[PDB]
Design an enzyme around this catalytic site. Sequence first.
Site, PDB file in Angstrom:
ATOM      1  N   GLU A  35       0.821  -1.198   0.000  1.00  0.00           N
ATOM      2  CA  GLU A  35       0.000   0.000   0.000  1.00  0.00           C
ATOM      3  C   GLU A  35       0.854   1.247   0.000  1.00  0.00           C
ATOM      4  O   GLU A  35       0.485   2.277  -0.586  1.00  0.00           O
ATOM      5  CB  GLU A  35      -0.942   0.000   1.221  1.00  0.00           C
ATOM      6  CG  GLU A  35      -2.025  -1.066   1.215  1.00  0.00           C
ATOM      7  CD  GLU A  35      -3.116  -0.810   0.178  1.00  0.00           C
ATOM      8  OE1 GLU A  35      -2.975   0.120  -0.690  1.00  0.00           O
ATOM      9  OE2 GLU A  35      -4.093  -1.563   0.229  1.00  0.00           O
ATOM     10  N   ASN A  46      -7.817   8.324  -5.655  1.00  0.00           N
ATOM     11  CA  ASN A  46      -8.544   7.261  -6.411  1.00  0.00           C
ATOM     12  C   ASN A  46      -9.394   7.930  -7.475  1.00  0.00           C
ATOM     13  O   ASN A  46      -9.671   9.136  -7.382  1.00  0.00           O
ATOM     14  CB  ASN A  46      -9.459   6.408  -5.505  1.00  0.00           C
ATOM     15  CG  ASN A  46      -8.744   5.831  -4.310  1.00  0.00           C
ATOM     16  OD1 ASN A  46      -9.273   5.812  -3.192  1.00  0.00           O
ATOM     17  ND2 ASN A  46      -7.524   5.367  -4.521  1.00  0.00           N
ATOM     18  N   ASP A  48     -12.388   8.038  -7.929  1.00  0.00           N
ATOM     19  CA  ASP A  48     -13.678   8.512  -7.469  1.00  0.00           C
ATOM     20  C   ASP A  48     -13.525   9.892  -6.794  1.00  0.00           C
ATOM     21  O   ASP A  48     -14.500  10.439  -6.306  1.00  0.00           O
ATOM     22  CB  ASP A  48     -14.312   7.455  -6.523  1.00  0.00           C
ATOM     23  CG  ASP A  48     -13.507   7.259  -5.266  1.00  0.00           C
ATOM     24  OD1 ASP A  48     -12.442   7.904  -5.166  1.00  0.00           O
ATOM     25  OD2 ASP A  48     -13.938   6.484  -4.380  1.00  0.00           O
ATOM     26  N   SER A  50     -11.708  10.395  -4.021  1.00  0.00           N
ATOM     27  CA  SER A  50     -11.357  10.241  -2.604  1.00  0.00           C
ATOM     28  C   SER A  50      -9.892  10.028  -2.634  1.00  0.00           C
ATOM     29  O   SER A  50      -9.310   9.781  -3.724  1.00  0.00           O
ATOM     30  CB  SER A  50     -12.012   9.024  -1.959  1.00  0.00           C
ATOM     31  OG  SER A  50     -11.577   7.799  -2.576  1.00  0.00           O
ATOM     32  N   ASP A  52      -6.546   8.035  -0.628  1.00  0.00           N
ATOM     33  CA  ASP A  52      -6.025   7.124   0.437  1.00  0.00           C
ATOM     34  C   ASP A  52      -4.755   7.635   1.178  1.00  0.00           C
ATOM     35  O   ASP A  52      -3.739   8.000   0.522  1.00  0.00           O
ATOM     36  CB  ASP A  52      -5.718   5.764  -0.191  1.00  0.00           C
ATOM     37  CG  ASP A  52      -6.913   5.085  -0.648  1.00  0.00           C
ATOM     38  OD1 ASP A  52      -7.978   5.664  -0.551  1.00  0.00           O
ATOM     39  OD2 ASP A  52      -6.825   3.954  -1.130  1.00  0.00           O
ATOM     40  N   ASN A  59      -8.884   5.289   3.291  1.00  0.00           N
ATOM     41  CA  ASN A  59      -9.603   6.021   2.259  1.00  0.00           C
ATOM     42  C   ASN A  59     -10.550   7.072   2.840  1.00  0.00           C
ATOM     43  O   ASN A  59     -11.327   6.783   3.756  1.00  0.00           O
ATOM     44  CB  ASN A  59     -10.480   5.025   1.479  1.00  0.00           C
ATOM     45  CG  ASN A  59     -11.066   5.623   0.235  1.00  0.00           C
ATOM     46  OD1 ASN A  59     -10.379   6.251  -0.563  1.00  0.00           O
ATOM     47  ND2 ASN A  59     -12.354   5.402   0.043  1.00  0.00           N
TER      48      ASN A  59
END
Length: 129
Positions: A35, A46, A48, A50, A52, A59
Amino acid sequence: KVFGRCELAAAMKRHGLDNYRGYSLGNWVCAAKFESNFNTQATNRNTDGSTDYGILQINSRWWCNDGRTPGSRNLCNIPCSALLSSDITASVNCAKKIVSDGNGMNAWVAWRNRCKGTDVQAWIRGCRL
Ligand SMILES: [Au+]
Ligand SMILES: [Cl-]
Ligand SMILES: [Cl-]
Ligand SMILES: [Cl-]
């Protein structure tokens, strides 16, 4: 902070993450690897909109607040920037709540894709815990 592999593994333990929801320590270290490559300051947008945050790429769509993810929850009741600290208590508190969400570690797409089923113990090899 970029943690050492054994260094993170020991911090995660002291914080109770090891066998949490039944996921053995090297599952976590494996997850943090893919990650964030162990970097607490790791951030990633991301598609969308959002983002992380941190060591475990928590997130902003559901877990933390960043002030720019529209229509979003803060289940972990924290600003997303606290997820970037050198002390990982905040990310770990939050990850406990995420892995207890019903899908366990699947919530980390990268864990499912890269750690799930593999020999995770290899991530805490040679460590003094
Ligand atoms: Au810590
Ligand atoms: Cl927001
Ligand atoms: Cl720490
Ligand atoms: Cl599970």
